Subunit: 450 residues, 3 copies
C-alpha cells in the first residue's frame, strides 16, 4: 500500500546559537532535513509533508527544489498539533511515517522494518535500548504489544530499569492519524499536545501497538547543539568510510577521511590521510590520492596519481595523468590522458591535450593547449586592461619557454617554439621560432659589499 | 580571606629525555607550569611561590615575566621539604594551596570547591576515584573526615578496594603549614619528607581533614613522559573544542582541531578539519576557515572566507575578503575589506586597499597598495643589491600587468596602467601608461624534433 | 638449536576486491607478508619457506629480493597440506615456527616466548583470550598441557565460556612435523587438511602441547578485507608513535602521525600534527617539523625547522637550515648548513651552499649554488628546446635579481650581480654586474575605465 511521510522541521534550535534554523545545519555537506527528505523519498513516499516555522524564509531558499508539501505552522503547541497541520492531506488508506528533521541518520532499512511490522488499524513504534535511559519514556510491553509509554517521573522502581525507550518515530494509516490526533489533549506539565499520546489512544480503541528496535542508537539521536552535531558527523563519516573499505577502497585512515556527496570508484583505489571528497566524484581504477587533497565535482580516469596538497574543482582528468603536489585545478579544467601538472600551477577553464606538461609556477586560464606541448616554468596567460577575458589557443607540439607571458587573445600554431622571457601578443605561425632579443649592460669589476 | 599558592616545579623529568626541565614542556603551546601559574592567578592568589631547581637558568629565561616568588631549592629531599622552603613567606591568616607544575589541567572551579570546604585550622584534601587505584595512597574516611592515607604496601584486603586516592593537592592556613611542616620526618623507605604526612599530623592535633573529589581524573594527572603529555594535550584540545562547539562554533571535527592560545569568535563561524589557531585570534561573524589553515595572531573580519592551506601570521583581514587557497600572509599584512588574495601569493608587511586583488604567483613585500587595484599574476616587488629594504607605493585604481617587477623604492600614482613583462624602476605618474617595447627575432620554418 | 619458519601466503583475498593477492596489501608502506618475513629473519630463522599460490607473478616481482624458499602450491586443500609442501626441506633437529602472511603484527618477542616454552618432541601453541570467542576453537587445558582444540559447534555449555582460543601459530621440531603432517586427514565439513589436527596427533603420541598466551590480540589478528587492514594500520601506527614518544620525540598528536619506514632521531625533536615520514629518515637534535609535512628518504641536520606544508624526498639538509612553508625538495636536493628555502620554491637535483637563500616563487633544477648567494623571487633555471637537461653553476656571493631566467648550460662566477628581469644565456665573470636595458613607451593621460 501507499506511503507518505511527515517531517518535523520547525525548531529554532536556540542552542546552536545561529541565524540558521535548526534543521538547515549540515551533516556531510547536506542539511539535516535534506538527509531525512532523501530517506523518505527512497522509502517510496508519495507525499512528504514538511512542517516548518522558524527561519521560514531561509528554509524556502535553501530547500527551494525539494519535492515536499510546505506546511507552515504559526504556533508551537506540541508535536501532535504539528502533525495535525498536515493531517488533512493524509489519504485514509496510505501509511504515514513520522520523522524528525533534526535526527538525520535514520535509515531506509530501519524504516522498512518499521512499516512491515505495522498491524492493520494499529501503530508501529520505533524504539531503542539505552544503557542510561534517564529522562526518556519507557516502553511497557504486555505480550508482544506496547500498552504504555511511562515517562521518567511517573515510573516506579522496576520500570526505571527498562532500557527500551521511545524515539518518537511511528507509522500508522492516515484515517487512524486523523482520528487519534483529534483526541490528543494538553493536560500535562508542559501544556503541549504530544504525539506520544497516540499510543495510549490506540490502546483505548483496542488497536495494536507493536515495537520495533532500531539497531543503531545514532539513527534516532537528534542534534540540539553543534557538539551533538559533530558527533553525528563523525559517526556518519565513519560509516561511509567503512562501506567504502568493505567495497575495496583503500582508505589509509577512515578517521581522517571526509565524503560530502557521492563517490563512484573502480578497483584498487588508494586514498591517503586527510582527503576531502565533495559533490559528485568519480574515480577510475588504480587512482591514487595523496595526503591533503580536496576533490569537488571531478572525474578522474584510470591510473591517475594525484600527489599531496592538490585542490581540484569541476574538472576532468584523463587516464594516466599525473597531478601535484601543490596543483590547483579550477572549474573547467580538462586534462587529457597522460598529462602532467606540477607544483604551484593553477589551471582555470582550459583544455590541455594528451601528453602535455605544465610542471611549475604557472597560470593557464581560458586556454586551449594541444598534445605534446611543453609549458615552461613561470609561464602566464594574461589579458589587456580592457573588459572581458579572452582566449589563448596553443596548438600541438609547442614549446613555450620559461617566464613567457601569453597575452590573449592570441594563437600559437602547431610546432612553434618560443624562447624564455618572451612577451607574446601577436599570433605565432606553424613552425615559427620566436626569441626575445635582449639588451644588457655588462660592468666589470663591480664589487659587492663584504 | 586571602590566598597564596605554592607550585612545585623542580623536577628534572628524566623520562622526557630532554634538555628542558620537566615543567617547561608545553600543552597547547604554553609550558605546563604556566597553565598552573595562570590558574593560581585567576583563583585570586596574592603570592605564587614557585619552587624550582633543575634547569634553573631555562626556567628563569622562559618564565622571566611571571609574577612569582622564585624559591630555588638546592637539594631534593621530598615535597614537604620543598614546600617548607616557601613557608617563611606564608602569612599566618591566609590560605595556602599546593599545586604541581607537572599537572597542568587542574581547574579554578575545582580549586574553589577545595578552598570552600577547608574547615578552620584544618586541611582540605583533593582526592579522586580510580578504577585501578594500585600504587596510590587510599583515602580512609571516618565520618566525613580523612583520618589517614594508607599506601599500597600497608593496606589490608578491604582497604585495597577503596577507589578514592590522594592527589597531593591540598589547602590549609599559613600558620598550620609552618607548624606541621616542621614536624614532618623522613623515616620511610625513600628517606624523604612527604607532604602526605600533614594529614596524619593534623589528626594528631585534633584538626579536621575533609576530602573533596575532583570531577575529572585528568585534572590531577601529571605527565612524566611525552606519551602522557600527549594524552593531556588531546584531552585539553577536546575540552577546548567542546566549549567552542557549545558556544556555537561549527568545528567539523573536534579531534582534528588545535587551539594554542585564545579564540574570540562571532556567530556562525565554520572551521573545517586540520586547522590550527595560535596566539590571539579574533574571528568575526560568518567567517569560514577551510581545511589545513594555520592562523597565528590574526584578526579576521565578518564574512571572510579563508580557503584551504592558507597560512596567516600577525595580520589583519577586513570584512568580506577572500583568501586562499595556498595563500601566505606574513607579519604586517593588512588586507582591507573586500580584497582578494589567491594561490601561491605571499604578502609581507604591506597594506592592500579595498577591493584590490592579488590572485596568483606573486610576492608583495614592504608595500602600500590602494583601493581597486589589479595586481597581475607573477608580479614581484624587489630591491636593489644594497643595504636596507625599501618601500613600493601603489595608489588607487592601478593595473599592474602580469610578470612585472616593481623595484623599490618606487611610487605608482592613481590610475596608472603597467603592461605585462615590465621592469619598473622610475616613478609612474597619474594616469600614465607604461608598456615595454620588446624586440623579437622570428625564424620561419624552424622544425622541432619529431 | 636452529630454527626455520614457514609463512602461509597463498590466499586470494577475495574480500579485498583487488587485483593484488591478499598478503601484498601494505601496512605502514610494507606488504603484510614482508612484515612477517622480517620478523622471521630477526628471530634467527635459517630458512623461510614461503607458501604462495594466487597472484604468483605479482608475489615474485614485489618480493624478488626476499631471502625465502619459494614453495608454489598448485591446489588449496587446507593449511596442513600447505605446510606439508615445505616439509621435505625441514631439518629433523631444527624448530619450525608456522606464521601467517595475513597476520603481520606478530612480534619477535612473543615468538621467542613461544619457542622457549616448546617441550622436546612436543608443540608450543600460541593462544589468545577473547571477550567474545564465538566461532573460534577453544583451548582445553588438563594440568599445564593442551589436550584438545574444540571448535564452536562441538563444544558443550561450559566449554563455550572458555575465552582462550587457537591462533594457528605453533612451533615444533622438523621430524615431528614430517611425522604428524603425514597423518592429518580431511574427514570434516570442509573436506580440508587442518594444521589444527596436529595438537590431537601429538596427544596421540603422548607428546606434550603447551599453551603460550599472546599479550596483544592484534598480534594474531589477520586482515581479510580493507576495513580490518585499516584497523591493523591504526594499531600499528599508534604503537610506533608511542615508542617514539617514550624515546623522547614530541609527537603533538600520535593519532595524526604516520611512519612508513624507519626513523632515526636525536633529542628534543618536535613533530606537529599530520606529518608523514616515509622510507629511511634521520632527524638530528632539536629538529622541528610543522604541520602537513611529508619527508621521504631524507637526512635533516641539528636545529633545522621545517615549516608547514613542505614536501621533501631524497634530500639532505644541513644544520640550522630553515625550510618552508610550502617548500618542495625533489630527489638530489642538497642544502648546506644555514640555508633558507621559502614558499612556492622547488629545488631538484641541486646543491645550495652555506647561508644561501631561495625564498620565493622559484625553480632551481640541475644546479650548483655556492655560499652566501641571494636567489631572488621568481628566478627560474631553464633549458633550450633540445635533448638532455644541462647544468647551471653559480659561485659564491652571487646576487640574482628577481624574475631572472638562468638558461643552462651557464656559469656565474663568484661575486657577480644580476639585475632583475634578466635573461642569462652567456657566462658571467667574477665581479661582473649584468643589468637588462629595457625600452619603455610612456603615454600620459591614459584614462582607465571608471
Ligand atoms: C526540528 O523540529 C523538531 C524536531 C523534533 N525531533 C524530535 N525527535 C528527534 C530527536 C529525538 C526524539 C526522541 C528521542 N530521542 C532520544 C533518542 C534516544 C532516543 C531523540 O534524540 C524525537 N522530537 C520532537 O518533538 C521534535 C520537534 C521539533 O519541532 C517541530 C515540532 C513542532 C514541534
Ligand atoms: C615537577 O615537580 C614536581 C611535581 C610533582 N607533582 C606531584 N603530583 C602531580 C602528579 C600526581 C600527584 C599525585 C597523584 N597523581 C596520580 C593522580 C591520580 C591521582 C599524580 O599524577 C602529585 N607530586 C610530586 O611529588 C611532585 C614533585 C615535584 O618535584 C619538586 C618537589 C621537590 C620535589
Ligand atoms: C594468506 O594465506 C593464508 C593465511 C592464513 N592465515 C591464518 N591465520 C591468520 C589469521 C587468524 C588465524 C587464526 C585465528 N585468528 C583469530 C585471532 C583471534 C585469534 C586469525 O585472525 C590463522 N589461517 C589460515 O588458515 C591461513 C591460510 C592462508 O592461505 C594459505 C594456506 C593454504 C591455505
Amino acid at each position: 500500500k501507499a506511503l507518505s511521510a511527515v517531517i518535523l522541521a520547525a525548531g529554532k534550535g536556540t542552542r546552536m546559537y545561529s541565524d540558521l534554523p535548526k534543521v538547515l545545519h549540515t551533516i556531510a555537506g547536506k542539511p539535516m532535513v535534506k538527509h531525512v527528505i532523501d530517506t523518505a523519498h527512497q522509502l517510496g513516499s508519495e507525499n512528504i509533508h514538511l512542517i516548518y516555522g522558524h527561519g521560514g524564509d531561509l528554509m524556502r531558499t535553501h530547500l527551494a527544489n525539494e519535492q515536499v508539501n510546505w506546511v507552515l505552522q504559526t504556533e508551537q503547541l506540541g508535536t501532535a498539533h504539528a502533525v495535525q497541520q498536515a493531517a488533512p492531506f493524509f489519504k485514509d488508506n496510505e501509511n504515514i511515517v513520522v520523522l524528525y528533521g533534526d535526527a538525520p541518520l535514520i535509515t531506509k532499512e530501519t524504516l522498512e522494518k518499521l512499516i512491515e511490522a505495522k498491524p492493520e488499524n494499529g501503530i508501529a513504534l520505533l524504539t531503542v535500548n539505552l544503557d542510561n535511559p534517564t529522562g526518556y519514556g519507557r516502553i511497557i510491553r504486555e505480550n508482544g504489544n506496547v500498552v504504555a509509554i511511562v515517562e521518567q517521573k511517573d515510573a516506579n522502581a522496576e520500570q526505571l530499569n527498562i532500557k527500551e525507550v521511545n524515539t518518537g518515530v511511528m507509522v500508522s494509516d492516515g484515517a487512524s492519524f486523523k482520528k487519534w490526533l483529534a483526541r490528543v489533549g494538553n493536560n500535562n506539565a508542559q501544556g503541549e499536545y504530544y504525539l506520544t499520546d497516540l499510543i495510549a489512544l490506540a490502546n483505548q480503541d483496542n488497536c495494536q501497538v507493536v515495537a520495533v528496535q532500531a539497531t543503531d542508537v545514532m539513527e534516532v539521536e537528534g542534534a540540539n547543539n553543534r557538539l551533538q552535531l559533530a558527533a553525528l558527523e563523525r559517526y556518519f563519516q565513519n560509516k561511509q568510510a567503512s562501506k567504502l573499505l568493505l567495497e575495496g577502497v583503500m582508505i589509509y585512515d577512515p578517521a581522517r577521511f571526509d565524503l560530502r556527496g557521492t563517490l563512484e570508484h573502480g578497483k584498487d583505489v588508494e586514498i591517503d590521510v586527510n582527503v576531502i571528497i565533495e559533490g559528485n566524484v568519480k574515480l577510475g581504477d588504480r587512482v591514487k590520492i595523496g595526503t591533503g587533497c580536496v576533490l569537488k565535482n571531478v572525474v578522474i580516469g584510470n591510473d591517475v596519481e594525484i600527489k599531496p596538497y592538490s585542490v581540484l574543482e569541476d574538472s576532468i582528468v584523463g587516464e594516466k595523468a599525473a597531478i601535484g603536489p601543490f596543483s590547483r585545478l579550477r572549474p573547467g579544467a580538462e586534462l587529457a590522458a597522460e598529462t602532467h601538472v606540477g607544483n604551484f600551477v593553477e589551471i582555470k577553464k582550459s583544455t590541455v591535450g594528451k601528453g602535455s606538461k605544465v610542471n611549475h609556477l604557472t597560470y593557464v586560464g581560458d586556454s586551449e593547449i594541444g598534445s605534446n606541448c611543453n609549458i615552461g616554468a613561470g609561464v602566464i596567460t594574461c589579458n589587456y586592461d580592457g573588459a572581458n577575458k579572452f582566449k589563448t589557443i596553443i596548438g600541438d607540439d609547442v614549446f613555450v619557454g620559461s617566464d613567457t607571458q601569453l597575452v590573449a587573445p592570441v594563437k600559437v600554431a602547431n610546432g612553434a617554439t618560443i624562447g624564455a622571457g618572451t612577451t607574446i601578443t601577436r599570433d605565432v605561425g606553424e613552425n615559427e621560432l620566436v626569441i626575445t632579443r635582449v639588451a644588457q649592460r655588462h660592468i666589470q669589476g663591480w664589487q659587492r659589499p663584504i
